[PDB]
Amino acid sequence: MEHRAFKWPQPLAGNKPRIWYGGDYNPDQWPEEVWDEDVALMQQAGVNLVSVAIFSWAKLEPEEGVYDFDWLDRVIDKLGKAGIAVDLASGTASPPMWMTQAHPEILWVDYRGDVCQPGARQHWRATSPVFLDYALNLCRKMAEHYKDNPYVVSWHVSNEYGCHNRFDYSEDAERAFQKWCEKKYGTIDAVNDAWGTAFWAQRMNNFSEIIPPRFIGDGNFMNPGKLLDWKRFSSDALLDFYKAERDALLEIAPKPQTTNFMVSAGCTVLDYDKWGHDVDFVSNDHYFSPGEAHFDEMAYAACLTDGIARKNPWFLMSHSTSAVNWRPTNYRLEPGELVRDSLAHLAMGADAICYFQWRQSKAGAEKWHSAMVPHAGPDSQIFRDVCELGADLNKLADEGLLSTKLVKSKVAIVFDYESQWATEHTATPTQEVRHWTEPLDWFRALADNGLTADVVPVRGPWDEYEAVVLPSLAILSEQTTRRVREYVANGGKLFVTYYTGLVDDRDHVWLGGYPGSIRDVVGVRVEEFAPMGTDAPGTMDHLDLDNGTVAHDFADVITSVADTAHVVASFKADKWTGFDGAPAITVNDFGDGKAAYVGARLGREGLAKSLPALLEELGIETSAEDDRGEVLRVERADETGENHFVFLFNRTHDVAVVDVEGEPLVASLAQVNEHTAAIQPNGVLVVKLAAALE
């Protein structure tokens, strides 16, 4: 509750505002003579900001209490003198070897008591008082040294908290988890009650009896209430460390500050919407998913970023020019995708576009990760494309893109980090169902029907939207249950799926029939589930619906439908399953609103096909056109609507022709005409609308 005031990295003295463009720069990894070439190439590419010193601790503090800043003063001076701004890191992302050799108590400990060693990065415990002292000291030294530097426009505090150190099981974590439980519950009776410890003789007499969820034998079942709280605690322990580092910097050197998130459809290492309350601006690292979901999942993640940002501008701190280096198979980007993907984030509300990283490493663990200047060097398709992007972004700022905001959708898809965590336990109805996939499925299926959804975290203002999707939203607290009931009562249009509202925020089941807190709203009562799969011969692996769709993985057993509701689709099945003729999809009237219930996993394709009848019943208007789905349309506008941009992205492997409605500004793999344009696969067109017209 409560965001910090929005702050943004400001232009250097004498510059106009720009879409910030550039990325991580690691000059410490090259001979100094390379730095003049870097700068010349950056000017060519239109680069205007770089992120420096992110893992430079071992250079800045080469041994305890010895500081070496001169190389970085020098780099920062050459950048600034060329008009390139610096987003400066704290430098505290990962500790040097001298530190972990003197203080092995810093290193995080795994569920079995094995100590993560140096050799990669981020091997520190979030609750180490010793690592905290080291970090805050370096933050103070950096702040003191760079506080009156005019080329430094922002702090980049640490890097991707929890990417490697989400979980620690040390004695430090044990003591901190105990204190976090006492602060959250007050008494051990309220912990026993929250975690349901009357089973398996788990009841505790005092706080000292709370241990971390350490090794219990592989395959055995941890207490779910406790594991959910362990995840909340791990997120909060890292957030407290961020806050301390932030506050140490800001007290000496008050500049716009952020830390880079890892928002993507499937990453929930942290409750990023909570974290969004502690940053001045939201910044995000996102790397494409391979294959057919590349475009859609990226637009989704960018959308959720914007939703975390409460529609404020946000900063894309990283993405790749082409391949990453950490998947089993590191696919390259296809032609056009470098520009398209950058513009996808821009469309969804970013006012900074940055890459990991500027110059591709020639040695170390990152050498095979793509860069803005590849091994090949500047004479490459990649660097030319980087240059073209630089020019596109200068153009879009010249035409007024800056501080426009992602337009308000008709539909808010709700997302809850905590509901995901809840669905991750091993003793749920099926390991094939998690929260995270369903909102992405709804985003894509709505796209197929010509509608661009907003993705809104559960804390944010989804109840202001024309329609709302609760997508496998396993947790509904008392508070959220009330928000839902009121939302619908007062004219809302609600879609609710299987695996919604199973439990409260303690992972206590809502009894009486699922979804046990909102049966009245949805007008159905579910008695049990029917998971599906192919784990043994003869298992039930699908259910047909009578609207021509197929359910996989999970279906609800709906045994009553209220009088104020009706059935829109029914399962068709072999008689012995009990599903022949059972209700699959319903719609209910509730006060002035409506709620549809989708009682099974239909996937993108099933939902896409199911949606027309449901959009019609709920009075949600969309384009009628056959080619509706071919292109994702994304809009930004200022509050007045006089600067309005539309970004059009082909989602397909066919040429998409579209009615073009304003002035074309940027075209990648697209040709304009007569208000027509043909967009090649992986193509994008961006248009500025004339405010005096339609």
Place this chain on the structure above:
Amino acid sequence: MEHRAFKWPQPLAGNKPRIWYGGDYNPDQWPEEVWDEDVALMQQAGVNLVSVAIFSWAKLEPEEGVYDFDWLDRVIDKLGKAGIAVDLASGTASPPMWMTQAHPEILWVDYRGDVCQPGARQHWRATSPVFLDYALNLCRKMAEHYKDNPYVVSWHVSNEYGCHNRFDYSEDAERAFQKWCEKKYGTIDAVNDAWGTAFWAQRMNNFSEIIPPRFIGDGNFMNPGKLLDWKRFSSDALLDFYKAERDALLEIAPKPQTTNFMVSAGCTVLDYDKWGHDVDFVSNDHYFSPGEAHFDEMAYAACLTDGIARKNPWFLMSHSTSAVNWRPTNYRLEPGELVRDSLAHLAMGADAICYFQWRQSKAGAEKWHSAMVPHAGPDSQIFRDVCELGADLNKLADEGLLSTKLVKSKVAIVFDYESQWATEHTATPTQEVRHWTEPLDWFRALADNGLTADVVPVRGPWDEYEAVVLPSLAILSEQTTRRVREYVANGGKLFVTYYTGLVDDRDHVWLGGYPGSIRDVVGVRVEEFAPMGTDAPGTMDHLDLDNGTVAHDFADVITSVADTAHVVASFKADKWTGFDGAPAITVNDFGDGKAAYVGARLGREGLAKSLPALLEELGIETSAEDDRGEVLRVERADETGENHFVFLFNRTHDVAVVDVEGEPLVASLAQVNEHTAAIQPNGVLVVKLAAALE
């Protein structure tokens, strides 16, 4: 050698004998006001026994030397006053947190020296003298308190020994394994000889040099003799703990006592047939396997339970109303299956039918496991079905089912826990072959041919049967070899498969040609094996036989056939494999008997098709009808045969019509006529035969 005298939980004062019906009850997990509702619902459902206090240690002994019995006196009083009996637990199944915090030496240790922590259940070492002292103390306190309680009719000692703590590698286990080896072998020379330690420089000078089979590098090969003995020792160490707990209870409070087994086709955590010698009555927990084997594997496991029970009545301590919560995908039961599955166990000789559990948990690790009263509550298909079952079981006891016994089959399928263990080593001909699958395959294939097999442990009286199957029975001791030779000599009909009699009880190979101890009996000599699979391109993955069947995974290389034998089926293969025309299935004459040899894995379907010619040759008579296989017929009768029941179960997804031969008593998804009945998929009919008729 030597069973205890059979004892059975007796009716409460003023009741007649009943099929015990109910399950685990955990009132400690609900507010006390719920207990009056539980009791009212139990009466409605026909519930007449519940199992209480199984994991209640942390409530009964909330801290060391403080006892709190009053809540359970109260619950037991309300149950008893409503006519519901209590199967009372020892309460010692899993220790409280205060205990493991004071005494971490209690916790079991894994192969790598990592200590299993509290967080789930049963984290105690079988050979901890300290955990033993705690357990026996609580057993004495419970026995003393409940010894003159008339509503307590049995002891339920601990719960599922070895489900989580089968293996411990602590210093306690090291010392105990040393003593178990000395007690078994007498001298270190006899251990060296048993384990074959002259390879890999493993020879030991004394007992102190025997360590547990701890971590040797993942992928490396433990000594097989030793690992087999480790498994026997782990089973015996838990059995000694059971015996001590039992004897501590019984000395103060002599009531019928059991501990719940985990008999299923594939579970061999313990030598359950040995354990069967130490219980007063056999009790079993069994949860359905998903997909097409659900019915058959359950009938098998129930059958093996009965065989462990030496045809005495046995107690089904647990099974599920619908889904469990511990598989990757927790399928629900289909309509009818709740009643059908319960009656399957009943048919195979159970005189008690109980579920985990009475009321579905609303919190903790078990919340998604089905119950008799689901989250949904009593207004559910599940609770109605539980009520219908209650009524069916009252009816069947009124008609005389109690203490009838599962009829003697023509065929005994032999099962050996130890042979399974032997086949589990990593350096066998193939990891795709284990003992356990073959007896289940034979049970199903015989069912397909209209015969209901008995499953008889190797120690029991299989040599009294008309026919006997040795199914991948890898171990044949000197003693069992002699029993087999005599059995056949004297008129027995024997089926022997691939992977039988490879080794003696020390895992020493019988030399000269497999199966090296009974070549004379089976009239074949095998020189080597041909495992099969798809592990690389071009591997041999099957062999056709000339009776229209296909072998997969394993075939024997038979190189001679005795004069008293002939070949019934031959492989057909590409010439270069060497299998074209080689013998696959033989029959031999040996004294007055016969032995068939099935020299490959044919599966249920191959064996089913192979069986007519083999049943004909061995003079085993079966129904001739085409629809033979559609229904499993299972019979119980008293010694006189004047109370005779027949249970008929559809195995198929078609409607099965059957000739009905007595008075119909219970019908689920079946309709009776003219002595005809039509049984729907998942249906069952139970009939009492008129003793004066056919």
